[PDB]
From Swiss-Prot, chain B:
PTM per Swiss-Prot/TrEMBL: Phosphorylated.
Superkingdom, taxonomy of origin: Viruses
Quaternary context: Binds DNA as homodimer. Interacts with protein E1; this interaction greatly increases E1 DNA-binding activity. Interacts with protein L1; this interaction enhances E2-dependent replication and transcription activation. Interacts with protein L2; this interaction inhibits E2 transcriptional activity but not DNA replication function E2. Interacts with protein E7; this interaction inhibits E7 oncogenic activity. Interacts with host TAF1; this interaction modulates E2-dependent transcriptional regulation. Interacts with host BRD4; this interaction mediates E2 transcriptional activation function.
Record's function text: Plays a role in the initiation of viral DNA replication. A dimer of E2 interacts with a dimer of E1 in order to improve specificity of E1 DNA binding activity. Once the complex recognizes and binds DNA at specific sites, the E2 dimer is removed from DNA. E2 also regulates viral transcription through binding to the E2RE response element (5'-ACCNNNNNNGGT-3') present in multiple copies in the regulatory regions of the viral genome. Activates or represses transcription depending on E2RE's position with regards to proximal promoter elements including the TATA-box.
Compartmental location: Host nucleus
Stretches the record annotates as DNA-binding domain: 3-87
Annotated family: Belongs to the papillomaviridae E2 protein family.
Name of the protein in its database record: Regulatory protein E2
Organism whose genome encodes this protein: Human papillomavirus type 6a
């Protein structure tokens, strides 16, 4: 009962443009997608905007990664969050 | 292990930012990282409200934050984990 996630990081406008593209072409390939966010203030490991994308399964996550071109300005990291946070 | 302990706070977003400024101001040494307010977007989401995520160096650290910090009437919380490499 961990949910598969991908975090996308980058300049917010490019990140929101990438969010837009996902909602327009690749919507069947993820479950939820967040507003842009960042780690606060004096402690951040980075000062770049972040978008969280969640999946119904690992199969969906892998098919998203296969089908979608991720912009070279955008970086991405795979992980999990507890399912009950959703 | 490679799982970071977290607390996810929820509520009206002005309440959450007010609470967030309080955490940063008085309770900084009681947690690791804290997000800006965010929500699930897209025609898709589950809930209706904004969210702030707080990360910890351990479960004992999170335990002590929760006995120390007074959570405003307007704010709900859940405990969870996320991958450490996402931080």
């Amino acid at each position: 009962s961990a949910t598969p996630i991908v975090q996308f990081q980058g300049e917010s406008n490019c990140l929101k443009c990438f969010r837009y593209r996902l909602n327009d072409k690749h919507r069947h390939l993820f479950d939820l997608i967040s507003s842009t966010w960042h780690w606060a203030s004096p402690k951040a490991p980075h000062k770049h905007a972040i978008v969280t994308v969640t999946y119904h399964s690992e199969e969906q996550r892998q098919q998203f990664l296969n089908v979608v071109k991720i912009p070279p300005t955008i970086r991405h990291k795979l992980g999990f969050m507890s399912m009950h946070l959703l």
